[PDB]
Write a protein that binds this ligand. Structure first.
Ligand SMILES: Nc1ncnc2c1ncn2[C@@H]1O[C@H](COP(=O)(O)OP(=O)(O)O)[C@@H](O)[C@H]1O
Ligand SMILES: Nc1ncnc2c1ncn2[C@@H]1O[C@H](COP(=O)(O)OP(=O)(O)O)[C@@H](O)[C@H]1O
Ligand SMILES: Nc1ncnc2c1ncn2[C@@H]1O[C@H](COP(=O)(O)OP(=O)(O)O)[C@@H](O)[C@H]1O
Ligand SMILES: [Mg+2]
Ligand SMILES: [Mg+2]
Lengths: 49, 48, 432, 436, 66, 66
């Protein structure tokens, strides 16, 4: 039994991909695959209009 | 109404208008997209 | 505004330009000349529309630039969006995920449309109160703008309502047959003036009419989509990712039988379509061998193909065949030959392209451009149309003149002039 | 870019208002006809109405095809998507070559979306769910400019509980999505314990409610890859899918068309704008026959971008073929679909001008005699070789104590390093000793 | 796997932002490819343009081939 | 200067790799020095261009002090 490898990195690296909400748009307006299994044709075509 | 303030109530009604507009815009945005297939189509096409 | 669909190489083509007798007009729906080829394409289109005969193959052959892809696009436009038209290139069947025969099978099954028609009884209303006693039994109250009723709930209904966290003010629909609950939205009250909303919440009006409603859904899906849906537990995800893999033949046979059962029951209709493979000479000998017997199925669409090769080498072999296609497959298909265009046809095509791009050209400019197109190629002249339009707009002009065409002819070279200039400096270029 | 690259001096095409090419402007020297053609191409790209038009830059190596493409990119600006790809980048081990080509095609097409974002940010002073289940959540957020009381949709309570949000924590809440991020504890509570494993963050300075109107550019590929795999999901299959290695997938044409429909819907609404953009393929001769055949179809699409190719090959064999030679390594059918821009070789004066521009870009002072010697070296060997001698010669000058390059430094560097022709001569003189 | 170009472009942008804001310093290094003659024409064609980026290191190669 | 490329060419056993190792030693551990062989870029896990992209990016370091 060996201890694990402790890999140390800069704390700034973990925030590289992070973008503040005031700096990014809502990508849920292009979310087509998220509607599958949750949204029905009735809701989109007959009810909501 | 001795302690009534006109500016505070104007601010509050402006805030209420903004809140209602936000509610409307979000409700329109959250139901704008239609599924490519939809639950009914998938259920019909999904064999046991 | 600028939409995602912009002026392309075939944006001017709206159809095959035929009359009721399938006789091609000289210039109709954006097509010029190719009368025999257009008549043959119209006959093939009538064959497609009838849908009686399965696995019919047509090869559109001719010199480069003679309108083969133009004719294919005319057939696609004339055919309704209801009828499937899968247009693929020959190189797209070489996949790192599935074999060539699997790619061709998926392409074949994508060309057959299945229109489904499901009628379902639903309950639709706004939730007023949910009372659960203790969770063995409870009551649910639903309302419309014209109705209100109370329902007695069982164990599974209570569990389903608790799983979806349905509460008062929610507008939901319940399927009577299966009991599944989907939430459409929630009603807006004075107390629901939220400052922040979740990504799925939306406010909807309370439904009107009657609490019990019938839902009719009609949609068109292909055989490949039904195959992918039934390939794995969440196979519908592969319809987005494309990580389908090689679907088992047993699944395809089961789906063929189920689709036939639906067709007998009246719950589905079959719309056989077209698979267009452009530049088929890129297919290997194995792909041609598979195509030979794939066309013999009763669920095979019309296979339209297009090549511009002469007697050349079949890919994967050392043999020479008239189109790069083995003569065994060529006996299974009818060949539509496209002839080179004349000066009048070239000028008419240039006029149609100019009208499509909204470019005004003088008649001298049209003569010069037609001469260039005959000398070099039609596509070069088509490109020079936009180049000359840009140059004319740069000098604050309104109509393209001969000077603009000469300027863009000097600026942009065709293949012949570029090859000559390269031969002048052959040692400069690499690996001659 | 702090570091100096090969084209760090190219700022534009150097044209005038009439489209004619200045002799030396925007870092470009010579290649007047090619620069005018590239200006016409830039005008084509700006006029968004054309789709699938393709351009080939054909000429000897070192004549400025890549520099011309980068000048086109500079003329367009950062608002227009310029996707640079190398012909050998289509040989992926995860997806087929045509999928790589279509992904790059969609990368070149850009979409501009204008949106106002609202975020509620501050230290949490109160977190009270209101029972009817929970009808709503009342939260109290504090900033340097005051306190605000907010009514939250009950679905946000799950997000608040998952994020472990308590009083004294600094959080932000997205108004449109209900997303909650707990970005540490307030530093006013840093002394509540002598040793806690906490990240203490200053109290936010501005107002609790922050509004910003932003313009963000996305490409069609971003929307394609966002819909290739599901995100989130509390089901067991969804959770296990997060552990699976992320692999590129052959995105279906159905998904592409549906995303196109969504984009058209938002363009019609007026919140989206389309930027067709440019895809630059360098070393296009590394594409094989299948890639060229697929390009035949892709360029004919009404949705494709403007594609610029570059090739330095002469009459050479197409990569996927056995013995078929073509003028640029490119099949004659694809050459029929492109407008060819020809680049010529440079005169000694043009080489001297380019060397001087490179010296200025690299912050190097060079004497007239040294510049003339470098130009003679370029005429004898190659322009690229003379440019690569500037920095080592400047280093020798700096070591010797001189702030400028003299002729002796250039001579010493030319002795220290060899060009391709000199090394090849050495190799031919010693064939037996070197490895075969 | 094959890291997406979008992630790499975003990282390059964030690293440029860090360098401009003083949060980080760039330390260019050396890539050494011993026996570079094992590379094929595709790898060489990639190297031709990969060296033109502002984030490219110094490339050192060794070969004994005639 | 970014992307400068140098080739060390010579007969077998003429110090080419010795010169490279001395260059690596003269640089400290602070500066990245990625040493690979040409054969190492041929992988079943990724493409050759991806392998060279990873080799290039391994040679540029970002120094962050906190
Ligand atoms: N009969 C025609 N009518 C109108 N346009 C045509 C006709 N034939 C060819 N074109 C146009 O000329 C160009 C080349 O024709 P295309 O069919 O793409 O060549 P190929 O037959 O070699 O595929 C396209 O822009 C196409 O729209
Ligand atoms: N006309 C020019 N003006 C200024 N610099 C140039 C010109 N042509 C080439 N260069 C520079 O010389 C080098 C070689 O040019 P490049 O575009 O790489 O040639 P290629 O056509 O082989 O891509 C690059 O550093 C480039 O910036
Ligand atoms: N100039 C030198 N100084 C010290 N050792 C050297 C020198 N040249 C070669 N060697 C040594 O000789 C051996 C041969 O390796 P090397 O000459 O580098 O092979 P190659 O140059 O063919 O890659 C190694 O042990 C190397 O360290
Ligand atoms: Mg064609
Ligand atoms: Mg060695």
């Amino acid at each position: 039994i060996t201890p694990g490898i402790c890999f140390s990195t800069a704390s700034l690296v973990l925030r590289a991909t992070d973008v503040h909400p005031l700096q990014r748009i809502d990508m849920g307006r292009f979310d087509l695959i998220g509607l599958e299994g949750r949204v029905s044709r009735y809701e989109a075509d007959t009810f909501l209009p | 109404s001795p302690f009534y303030l006109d500016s505070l109530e104007e601010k509050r009604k402006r805030q209420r208008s903004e809140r209602l507009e936000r509610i409307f815009q979000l409700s329109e945005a959250h139901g704008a997209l239609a599924p490519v297939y939809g639950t009914e189509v998938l259920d019909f096409c999904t064999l046991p | 505004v600028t939409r995602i669909e912009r002026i392309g190489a075939h944006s001017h083509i709206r159809g095959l330009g035929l009359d009721d007798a399938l006789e091609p007009r000289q210039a109709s729906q954006g097509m010029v000349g190719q009368l025999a080829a257009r008549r043959a394409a119209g006959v093939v289109l009538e064959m497609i529309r009838e849908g009686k005969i399965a696995g019919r193959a047509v090869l559109i052959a001719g010199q480069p630039g003679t309108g083969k892809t133009a004719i294919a696009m005319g057939m696609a436009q004339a055919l309704g969006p209801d009828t499937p038209f899968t247009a693929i290139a020959g190189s797209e069947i070489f996949s790192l995920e599935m074999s060539k025969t699997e790619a061709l099978t998926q392409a074949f099954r994508r060309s057959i449309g299945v229109r489904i028609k499901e009628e379902t009884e639903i309950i639709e209303g706004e939730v007023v109160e949910i009372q659960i006693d203790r969770s063995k039994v409870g009551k649910l109250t639903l309302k419309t703008t014209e109705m209100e009723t109370i329902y007695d709930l069982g164990t599974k209904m209570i569990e389903s309502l608790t799983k979806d966290k349905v509460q008062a003010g929610d507008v939901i629909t319940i399927d009577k047959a299966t009991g599944k609950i989907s939430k459409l939205g929630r009603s807006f009250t004075r107390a629901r003036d939220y400052d922040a909303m979740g990504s799925q919440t939306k406010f909807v009006q309370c439904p009107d009419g009657e609490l019990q409603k019938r839902k009719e859904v009609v949609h068109t899906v292909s055989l490949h989509e039904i195959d992918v849906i039934n390939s794995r537990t969440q196979g519908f995800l592969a319809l987005f990712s494309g990580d389908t893999g090689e679907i088992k033949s047993e699944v395809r046979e089961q789906i063929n039988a189920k689709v036939a059962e639906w067709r007998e029951e009246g719950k589905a209709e079959i719309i056989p379509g077209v698979l267009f493979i452009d530049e088929v000479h890129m297919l290997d000998i194995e792909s041609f061998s598979f195509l030979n017997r794939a066309l013999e199925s009763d669920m095979a669409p019309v296979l339209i193909m297009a090549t511009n090769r002469g007697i050349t080498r079949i890919r994967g072999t050392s043999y020479q065949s008239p189109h790069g296609i083995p003569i065994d497959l060529l006996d299974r298909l009818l060949i539509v030959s496209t002839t080179p265009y004349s000066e009048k046809d070239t000028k008419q095509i240039l006029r149609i392209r100019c009208e499509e791009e909204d470019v005004e050209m003088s008649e001298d400019a049209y003569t010069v451009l037609t001469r260039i197109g005959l000398e070099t190629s039609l596509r070069y002249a088509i490109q020079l149309i936009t180049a000359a339009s840009l140059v004319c707009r740069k000098r604050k002009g309104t109509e393209v003149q001969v000077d603009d065409i000469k300027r863009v002819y000097s600026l942009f070279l065709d293949e012949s002039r570029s090859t000559q200039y390269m031969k002048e400096y052959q040692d400069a270029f690499l690996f001659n | 870019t702090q570091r100096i690259a090969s084209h760090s001096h190219v700022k534009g095409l150097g044209l005038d208002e009439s489209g004619l090419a200045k002799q030396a402007a925007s870092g470009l020297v010579g290649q007047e006809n090619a620069r005018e053609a590239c200006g016409v191409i830039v005008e084509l790209i700006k006029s968004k109405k054309m789709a699938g038009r393709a351009v080939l830059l054909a000429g000897p190596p070192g004549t400025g095809k890549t520099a011309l493409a980068l000048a086109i990119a500079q003329e367009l600006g950062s608002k227009v998507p310029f996707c640079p790809m190398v012909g050998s980048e289509v040989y992926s081990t995860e997806i087929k070559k045509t999928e790589v080509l279509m992904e790059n095609f969609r990368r070149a097409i850009g979409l501009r979306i204008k949106e106002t974002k609202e975020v509620y940010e501050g230290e949490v002073t109160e977190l009270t769910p209101c029972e009817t289940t929970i009808s709503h959540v009342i939260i109290g957020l504090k900033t340097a400019k005051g306190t605000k009381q907010l009514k939250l949709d009950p679905s946000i309570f799950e997000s608040l509980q998952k994020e472990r949000v308590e009083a004294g924590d600094v959080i932000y809440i997205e108004a449109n999505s209900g997303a909650v991020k707990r970005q540490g504890r307030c530093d006013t509570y840093a002394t509540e314990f002598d040793l806690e494993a906490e990240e203490y963050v200053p109290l936010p300075k501005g107002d609790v409610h922050k509004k910003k109107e932003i313009i963000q550019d996305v490409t069609l590929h971003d929307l394609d890859v966002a819909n290739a795999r599901p995100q989130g999901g509390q089901d067991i299959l969804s959770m296990m899918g997060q552990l699976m290695k992320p692999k590129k997938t052959e995105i279906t044409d159905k998904l592409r068309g549906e995303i196109n429909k969504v984009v058209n819907k938002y363009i019609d609404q007026g919140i989206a704008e389309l930027v067709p953009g440019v895809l630059f393929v360098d070393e296009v001769h590394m594409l094989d026959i299948e890639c060229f055949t697929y390009l035949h179809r892709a360029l004919e699409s009404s949705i494709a971008p403007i594609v610029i190719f570059a090739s330095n090959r002469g009459n050479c064999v197409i990569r996927g073929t056995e013995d078929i030679t073509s003028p640029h390594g490119i099949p004659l059918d694809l050459l029929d679909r492109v407008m060819i821009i020809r680049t010529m070789l440079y005169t000694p004066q043009e080489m001297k001008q380019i060397i001087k521009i490179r010296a200025q870009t690299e912050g190097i002072n060079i004497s007239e005699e040294a510049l003339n010697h470098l130009g003679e070296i370029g005429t004898k060997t190659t322009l690229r070789y003379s440019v690569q001698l500037l920095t080592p010669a400047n280093l020798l000058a700096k070591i010797n104590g001189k702030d400028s390059i003299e002729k002796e430094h250039v001579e010493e560097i030319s002795e220290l390093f060899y060009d391709a022709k000199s090394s090849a001569k050495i190799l031919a003189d010693q064939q037996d000793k070197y490895m075969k």
